[PDB]
């Protein structure tokens, strides 16, 4: 099955599950998402505030956590276990 | 024992299956059932005195299906009635 007039159809370049419908939403739903997700578009810009915002948000709740929230900030609550040879 | 229900079933299970194998109602050596359960004639090579094609294999085969079916009817009716 080789054609020499359509090179994509004879090699497997098929949109197997694609659709050519232009739109199925309405204008009210579409204008809401592009307004809110307009500052999240650029890859270089989005990678900057996700690293800087992600480093702050793990250091905040890592430090403001309580004893019941995380056991490493609870500390010891009993007498320490003495090892052998008096150590 | 002759008039008992074991004897009357086992006679009639053997007789009707030999009747079916002789009068062309059951599969036999000289006639084959296909996937459509249709009786088509074949030459098995076995020669007896029957003009229909009943041979010594079928009287052992239909006697066995007279007995395999006939044992199950007798003990099926023994546990039920």
């Amino acid at each position: 099955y080789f054609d020499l007039g359509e090179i994509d159809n004879t090699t497997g370049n098929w949109d197997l599950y694609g659709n050519d419908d232009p739109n199925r939403y309405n204008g009210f739903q579409n204008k809401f998402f592009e307004t809110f997700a307009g500052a999240f578009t650029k890859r270089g810009l989005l990678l900057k505030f996700l690293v800087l915002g992600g480093a702050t948000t793990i250091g905040y709740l890592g430090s403001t956590s309580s004893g019941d929230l995380l056991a490493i900030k609870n500390g010891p609550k009993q007498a320490p276990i003495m090892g052998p040879r008096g150590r | 024992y002759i008039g008992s229900s074991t004897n009357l079933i086992m006679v009639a299970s053997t007789t009707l299956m030999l009747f079916a194998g002789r009068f062309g109602l059951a599969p036999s050596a000289n006639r084959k059932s296909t996937a459509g359960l249709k009786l088509v004639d074949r030459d098995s090579g076995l020669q007896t005195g029957d003009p229909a094609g009943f041979t010594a294999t079928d009287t052992l085969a239909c006697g066995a299906m007279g007995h395999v079916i006939g044992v199950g009817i007798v003990l099926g009716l023994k546990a039920t009635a």
Binding site: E6, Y17, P22, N23, L50, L69 | -
Partner: protein, 160 residues
Amino acid sequence: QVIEPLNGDPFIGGLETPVTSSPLIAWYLSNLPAYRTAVAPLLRGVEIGLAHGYLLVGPFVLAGPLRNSAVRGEAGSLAAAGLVAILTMCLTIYGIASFKEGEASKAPSLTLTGRQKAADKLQTAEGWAGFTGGFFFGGLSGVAWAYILLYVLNLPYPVK
């Protein structure tokens, strides 16, 4: 009689099985937000984000480490929103690596039949850019709405 080759071609590595080209399956897969080739890729990326955002609150509130406290709504939703923010950066660095700014689309233009269609804009440097922001806003809203419907309104369910 039931199995065909892929678009009649036996030498492409696939088959037209009932799990691939059913009347029901090929209707389904053609309406899923990833295979809309003419919708703008920020809008269909919000639906890919709302979905995955919602579903991920479930295994993080019912199985996580803080599942036996009263903070199980707050701990698991921020854990579900944390996987959104990581996968947004995984979506960010994928579009930086795969697609270059100013290039064409690495997408099959031809459909199942011989009709010529427009190129899919998702496999571009700007199409995956708006797709990444669609997953970030949709994912953070999909987590927050599943947190609202579970631990703010507290709707009755057998397991919550």
